[PDB]
Amino acid sequence: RQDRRSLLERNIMMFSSHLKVDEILEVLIAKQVLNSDNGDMINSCGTVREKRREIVKAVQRRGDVAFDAFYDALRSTGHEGLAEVLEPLA
Amino acid sequence: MLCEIECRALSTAHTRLIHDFEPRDALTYLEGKNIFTEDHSELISKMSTRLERIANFLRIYRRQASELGPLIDFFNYNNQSHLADFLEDYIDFAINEPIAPQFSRQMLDRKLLLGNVPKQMTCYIREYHVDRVIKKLDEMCDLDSFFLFLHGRAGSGKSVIASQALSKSDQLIGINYDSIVWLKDSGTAPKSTFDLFTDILLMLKSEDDLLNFPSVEHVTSVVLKRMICNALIDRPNTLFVFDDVVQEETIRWAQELRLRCLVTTRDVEISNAASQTCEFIEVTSLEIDECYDFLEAYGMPMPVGEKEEDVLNKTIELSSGNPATLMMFFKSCEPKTFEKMAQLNNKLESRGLVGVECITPYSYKSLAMALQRCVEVLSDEDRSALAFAVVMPPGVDIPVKLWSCVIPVLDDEVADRLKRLSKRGALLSGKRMPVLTFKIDHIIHMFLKHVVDAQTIANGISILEQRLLEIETVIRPEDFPKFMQLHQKFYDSL
Amino acid sequence: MLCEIECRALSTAHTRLIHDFEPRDALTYLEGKNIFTEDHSELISKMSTRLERIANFLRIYRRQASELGPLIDFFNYNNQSHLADFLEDYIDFAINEPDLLRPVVIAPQFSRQMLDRKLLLGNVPKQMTCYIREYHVDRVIKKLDEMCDLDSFFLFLHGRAGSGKSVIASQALSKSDQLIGINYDSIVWLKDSGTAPKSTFDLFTDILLMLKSEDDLLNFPSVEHVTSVVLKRMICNALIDRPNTLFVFDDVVQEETIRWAQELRLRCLVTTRDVEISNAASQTCEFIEVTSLEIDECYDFLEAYGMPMPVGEKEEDVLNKTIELSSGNPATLMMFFKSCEPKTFEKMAQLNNKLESRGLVGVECITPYSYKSLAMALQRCVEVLSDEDRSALAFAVVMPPGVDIPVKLWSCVIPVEQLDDEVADRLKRLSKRGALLSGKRMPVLTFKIDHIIHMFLKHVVDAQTIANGISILEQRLLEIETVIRPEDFPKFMQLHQKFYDSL
Ligand SMILES: Nc1ncnc2c1ncn2[C@@H]1O[C@H](COP(=O)(O)OP(=O)(O)OP(=O)(O)O)[C@@H](O)[C@H]1O
Ligand SMILES: Nc1ncnc2c1ncn2[C@@H]1O[C@H](COP(=O)(O)OP(=O)(O)OP(=O)(O)O)[C@@H](O)[C@H]1O
Ligand SMILES: [Mg+2]
Ligand SMILES: [Mg+2]
């Protein structure tokens, strides 16, 4: 929705500063929020801003309730991210 | 949407946004900031050349944003800060505060021409008038629609002054009004007031689609009128000179079309057609001093002897400061000798205006060709009154009753006709006190005389002697009307 | 298709849809939601300027959609939400909360210059400024405001010839900034003056033109030849694009023309002289009569145009003479001024004479009136008259003007058992139809002829028929002021010997 997406957009710098969609594909797909093909397509992207744009869209759709993902930046040592988005979520 | 200011900036800083920039770079930052719709970024993102992506980014952008802040924002982050700095500087030299002359002239010249304005007279200008015209036009560029009546005697020089008043100052065209449309009327038929406005619209018409000009020749008045206003909306501050209006219908149309009009005319009353208060400027007979100036200006020798300044006061007397007939005089005084100047003085009498009729910048060989019309238009009853004014001495202030003697029909009715008569061609000279008196000048006098029935002159003279029975600056007293004999001199010459 | 509310919105919010919008942006979204055809998008998609793509998008759109919904949905998605928000606000101040639309969502969008654009294009003339009839221009505007709600209606601004009706419509649509923009979206002001039977069709040929876009005046066909059923059907079709459009029909003479207006379900202001043309409309007709200028209003009107004010007993009287003869006639009063060039009470009284010994022709002048003198106008008012009524009028000259006089006293000069009420019936038709007569029910049924209405007849009717009517009355005179001439004293019309000897 507008709140969730507005969050993926507001916290765009950090996501598009560090972060990597390859890192989340195995998890998100493990959560069934992603498809093998989805991961494959993203996995096969030359630059990261490409792999990032895709995931954001995917999250805004497939993972509208990216709550699960909100526990992913936790596990990935990128907790300074999942903490910011929980603030937005809050 | 960016305002003129904000759009004038994207345009001024355009030589730069072409040398180093790219709309693909900004699309993500705009879509991300909810500034670009998917299709927007598609449209600007798939473009072969960059001048395409740039022209679409600057077109699409000017519509979408409530302001210019985001543009600067992006220009910064993109290492193109030398750009976002220039634009922020420009927005500030407006937010915090409230060329070649000859080259510029060409624009003025073109404006004058395309509006079919003729060239202004140069060898001699009655500044006063040209000045006062321009002034009263400046006062009105504010107004939504208005009439200016530059009226005067036939050939008194009105049209030349409009040529000059729109040609001297560089403000009237460009500063006060955007464009000029100058159309000569001269309409007498009833189809003329429509034909005029057929050609007015043409002036407005683009250079394109003069080819497509239809058989507009056949289409109602309600439509030519509606058609014109449509085109009128396109042009702002469009001044209209209507050189030579005779029919009040022109004024009427001018007022249905909510036009801004300069108007040269001879008959002043056409203004009663317009309910709106109309301003007026009368082109008087050339004052005695202005006549000198006008003569010198065109190589004419100034007085040297008592009976030489007099030879020249004779021409001025006969011409009564008449621009047009004065000019005809010069074109004839080839010897340029006080002598051949006096030959004409005498000749003009024993032949009326026809003695000096010549090829002149005037459409007319002689002032008699002009006045013809001024006389045809006259009320059938008024055409009569004018015919009997010949008997009276010209250049003499004379009572109403002394006139009641020759004029057909309390005889105030005579006065009413004589007013209509000065109002409608400056044929007569009114003058309220000391006592209600009129006067006929020589130009007009000679004209009427030579024009009428050789009989009606002599009949009016006799019809006067009858009333002579009763029972100079100093107007003629009622104890001494019995003798019009003071002017025996100016009467025996019949 | 939509309607007047949904189309009035696309029109009100038009100053905006021009500054930021593009029909190319919406074509894909509408070929989709089932509102467009692949020629539709072709027609609006290949257009050089945007005002073209916009005028075609708003024309084509008003026909295609069952409602105004996807549009709102669109300006939302297109980052032009400041638009879809304005239009949804407007659609809401109509269904739920009525009334509030004009004060709230329409009033702010006023601008004097806009009116002038709209006035000029609707062929409205400029309003008189040097004097304004307060009362009337006000009451006109009022009764127009009360009706912007109505779907179709007639307003009859009826009065005597030159009585000043047309000028008031110029002012009533030019003073307030609401009538145009707030109450009605556009104006169409057309002068009728139709007498031929082709005139009522020719009128409506121009009405459609007055409607048609600046584009396709080129394509204007030989519409000159096409049935009445089609010009009529052809007009309403375009009318769609015209929400809250008002119609001034300056100078209707024909009731047939009156009709068409009611087949076309139009909203009409109507200036006319003959009031009965309204019987053509079964629709409720509301009326405003332009009376003769009251004695006080005449003063105001004179001063307004540099006319001196009475200074002496027999100077206020010099001026009561003009007002009497003029009987407060805007048009002939104006002709007076344009002629009263000296402006001196003296030359003002000179004319007061010229008027008795030359009728209206003594003061005929070039005036903002299409007419040299009020006689040129009244000509028509008299031609139209029932052949029998033309007769009745023609004999009224004998009667004293500005005198309240009984029906029987009239039965004496007027043509035609024992009850002559037929005289009264003619005299009513006579005031109804150009207002050439006065009427007064009680104390007793009496009529009256004014002076402007009198001098005209005096100078026009057969010099003989005047003298024949004078002799006729004498025979009937034999019989056996505020107070109506009593029946004990009719035998002597001699009270008015003064105003009778002058014949
Ligand atoms: N410098 C001048 N200023 C004024 N009049 C001039 C001047 N030079 C010449 N004239 C005379 O006036 C003629 C044109 O007169 P003009 O057209 O100004 O009068 P007008 O008021 O237009 O007359 P009309 O009544 O025909 O409209 C010239 O060709 C010449 O005869
Ligand atoms: N308020 C006014 N101010 C100035 N002049 C007026 C006014 N009202 C009427 N007149 C005079 O009447 C003339 C036009 O009259 P108007 O058209 O208003 O009357 P009307 O009732 O339309 O007559 P008709 O029905 O014949 O059109 C103007 O030229 C002016 O002389
Ligand atoms: Mg000229
Ligand atoms: Mg009118």
Author numbering:
A (entry chain C): 3 to 92
B (entry chain B): 1 to 98, 106 to 416, 426 to 487, 521 to 543
C (entry chain A): 1 to 416, 424 to 487, 521 to 543
Text taken from the publication that reported this structure:
We thereby assembled the ternary complex of CED-4/CED-3_CARD/CED-3 catalytic domain, hereafter referred to as the holoenzyme, to mimic the full-length CED-4/CED-3 complex (orange). In the presence of the catalytic domain of CED-3, more than half of CED-4, 52.1% existed as octamers. The octameric CED-4 is nearly identical to that in the crystal structure, with the eight CARDs observing a group I stacking. The ring-like density on the top of the CED-4 apoptosome can be assigned with four CED-3 CARDs. Overall, the tower is of ∼120 Å tall and ∼170 Å wide at the bottom. CARD–CARD interaction between CED-3 and CED-4 involves helices H1 and H4 of CED-3. Basic residues on CED-3, including Arg7, Arg63, and Arg64 appeared to contact the acidic residues on CED-4 CARD, including Asp20, Asn78, and Asn79 (cyan rectangle). Compared with WT CED-3 CARD, less R7D co-migrated with CED-4, whereas R63A/R64A no longer associated with CED-4. In contrast, neither CED-3 R7D nor CED-3 R63A/R64A responded to CED-4 apoptosome, supporting an essential role of the CARD–CARD interaction in CED-3 activation (lane 4–6). However, in the structure of the holoenzyme and the CED-4/CED-3_CARD complex, four CED-3 CARDs were resolved.
In Caenorhabditis elegans (C. elegans), onset of programmed cell death is marked with the activation of CED-3, a process that requires assembly of the CED-4 apoptosome. CED-3 is synthesized as an inactive zymogen; its activation requires association with the CED-4 apoptosome. Activated CED-3 forms a holoenzyme with the CED-4 apoptosome to cleave a wide range of substrates, leading to irreversible cell death. Here, we report cryo-EM structures of the CED-4 apoptosome and three distinct CED-4/CED-3 complexes that mimic different activation stages for CED-3.
